[PDB]
Amino acid sequence: GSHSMRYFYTAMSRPGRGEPRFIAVGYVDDTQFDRFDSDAASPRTEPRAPWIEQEGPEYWDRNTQIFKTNTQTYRESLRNLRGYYNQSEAGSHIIQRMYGCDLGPDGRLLRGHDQSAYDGKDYIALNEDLSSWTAADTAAQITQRKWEAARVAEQLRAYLEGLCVEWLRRYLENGKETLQRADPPKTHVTHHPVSDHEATLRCWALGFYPAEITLTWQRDGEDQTQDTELVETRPAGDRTFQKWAAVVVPSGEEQRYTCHVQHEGLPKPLTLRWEP
Amino acid sequence: GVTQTPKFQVLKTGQSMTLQCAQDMNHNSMYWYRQDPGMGLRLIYYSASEGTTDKGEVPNGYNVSRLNKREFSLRLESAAPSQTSVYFCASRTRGGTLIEQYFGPGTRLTVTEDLNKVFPPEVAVFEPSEAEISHTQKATLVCLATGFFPDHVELSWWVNGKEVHSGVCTDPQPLKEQPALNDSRYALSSRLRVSATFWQNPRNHFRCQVQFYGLSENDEWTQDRAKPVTQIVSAEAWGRAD
Amino acid sequence: QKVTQAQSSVSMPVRKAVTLNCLYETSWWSYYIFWYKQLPSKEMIFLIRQGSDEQNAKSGRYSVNFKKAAKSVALTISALQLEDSAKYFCALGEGGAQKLVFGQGTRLTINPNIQNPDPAVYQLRDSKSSDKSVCLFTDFDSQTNVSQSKDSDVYITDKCVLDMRSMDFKSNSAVAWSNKSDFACANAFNNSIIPEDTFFPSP
């Protein structure tokens, strides 16, 4: 909907190179606000956004205590998985998991999320009702039976509906000057002939936030989406993003093409033409 | 579930000793708590997995090691009289809502400055009063265990071979025979009440059995009296019609 | 101060219900409260759990009144049985990997309700050397308490309840003994609030 919080856990076993490594990052919408890495000298939770640093010392000690324990739990999970699939302790394996809550335009919990992957594939997932699971395979069903017996879905539903929502709001306020302030994209069209017959029109959008945006090339007001070449929205490095759309058009028809830009930061949807 | 040995122990000041704990439940988090006589439990050390151990409300004098996931051992190093207490091991699952810890039977540990304070119990059974029998048509037996130290005893009644609970009342806590002295010896009484008819049958057997916990055979005793070893001191009584 | 149980010991007639208080202090955003019951054997058995974001917990005869704002989590036991006699502990589990801080415990004593009071002091004969003797104070009602005697070589056990289940009969009892020859059951409990109608047989 309007706002969200996410955590991204990555655990990788590395036989011979040491113990399984655990990394965690936290996002509010598209702003990373904290990180944890077990490979550090003396691992600690660390700020990745100035506004989170309003939290007292107790906050960071507490978070570190948690990510420290996750390090162990996932090492134990990597073992279990290896068991589930009958794999040697010689191969390297990864566990990934992303969970979090979504807010509506009015601070209400829209829906919750929790998914685990094994070697970059769907493994297990908490369903929309936050009371059931969807296992990907026979191995995942073993985890499910334990989690059903352990009542994990109930622990999450209480979190996604409770602490996750309270604290997401808490951050939106504490950092409203950067989280709720939308940065409109700077735009402009470019033209580049490919031959004597055709030419490329490219529509730019830069320095924008959040990352959610819609660049669509129209020919006579009709979206040429299937013909529009997009690139993955990318990080400018300053917390704002970049993107461009491109189309190959015939020479002389250039003026029948408009570029529309939709973004939370734009009062009204922009319309752009190549202006030689 | 969660087994813990030894269940009883006596120590001389300055001794080292290890308590063993093993949970058969596949849990991940293990704890070692300490409970003083009239107080509650306080954490000493705990571990989230093998190879990792953390403090600890009162870690001083204790070391610990999670040698693996099923086993978690605690040490006393230099036994001190102040370390007299009931040490509890604990185990619990992580994740989900059933996160309560499961405790082992416990380890009652007394530490004494001088092992010459250790005495077994003297156990006697006192037969029912005749006035009681004529007044209530019921007969109460009383078992008395005295002069024992430490207070590490287990009392049980046996009637015609069977261990009995019905009609039985054992003092909740043993009492210092000298509440003034530090290492005072204790006394514990128990009652077994049956019908006069039952007691009046001479063919009926009533036995009071008191399991004491003191020294082991290994221990190097020197004093002239018999070594106060772990043992069972018993007394009994048979039916009587007069 | 982190966990406080305001009652050191509470008495209750059988069949009724009792509430045991427990107040705590925590700055944690996620925690749990646990109620355990300790037996005379020191055995520590689990009763009920209360999550920080949970409805009031109810497990059979055990229910919890969770006042999150006042950080109060009093336990209530209904239909008091005689097995309920024990020490009850309230434990805070803040974590994480939650290291429990325990209340200091409440002593719960369930009284049997004596429908046919018959306070008497009997003297029992020694089985072996029949001159040493012990005094039995029995069949008084749960209202009466038993305390020590002024003497130093005279021992008096705390009263306790036994249940002759095969007869649906329950009674209170207390035992006293001494080495002295000038000791007699006559005044073993003299310095105690004992009923006037207490049966003292002779000799």
Partner: peptide, 9 residues
């Protein structure tokens, strides 16, 4: 704030 405690896979 992260999930307080992770369940084992």
């Amino acid at each position: 704030i992260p999930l307080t405690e992770e369940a084992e896979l």
